[PDB]
Amino acid sequence: NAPEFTQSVCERNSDCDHFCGEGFGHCIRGMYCACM
């Protein structure tokens, strides 16, 4: 069993620059996002 449903919330780190703000956005593995 190998499931993967962890959809990329950000395709680009710059999506996180919209979510957390530019310079505060970090895409973790291109899976989920974390803010500075």
3-class SS at 34?
strand
Q: Tell me the residue type at 11.
A: E
The string of DSSP letters for 4-33 reads -----S-SSHHHHHHHT-TTTEEEETTTEE
Domain of residue 31: give its range. Answer: 1-36
- The total of structural domains in the chain comes to 1
The pairing of strands 25-28 and 32-35 is antiparallel
Separation between Cα atoms, residue 28 and residue 1, nearest integer Å: 24
* Maximal CA-CA distance, the chain: 38
Residue 31, beta-bridge partner list: none
Q: Which approach determined this entry? A: NMR
Residue 26 burial by Cβ neighbours in a 10 Å radius (0-12, 13-18, 19+): middle
Place of tokens 């979510």: 19
- φ and ψ at residue 21, rounded to 5 degrees: 110, 150
How is residue 2 annotated by DSSP?
Answer: -
